Amino acid sequence: IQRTPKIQVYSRHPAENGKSNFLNCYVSGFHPSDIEVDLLKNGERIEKVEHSDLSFSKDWSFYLLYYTEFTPTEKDEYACRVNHVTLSQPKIVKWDRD
């Protein structure tokens, strides 16, 4: 079957403006494995983005972690854009600092 992805956006450490940190986009519970993920900084696609190995859970659904080193600011807005066969249009999830 085809399963739609679940998208989570969070920082590696508690966010502090002006301090170095990592921004993560964890995409899980999807099928098939083909997926497109992009991390956004004020709507612009981030170039230096790494990702983990495509692995799967007990229910056989796939999961993947995308991450980038960043320094948050008061005005900067971040988001994760994911595209999959199950999605009519790319799903964008904004980073909620909380």
């Binding site: 969070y10 993560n24 964890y26 983990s52």
Partner: peptide, 8 residues
Amino acid sequence: GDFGPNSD
């Protein structure tokens, strides 16, 4: 709740 890994 939600749960997930970090790069390390």
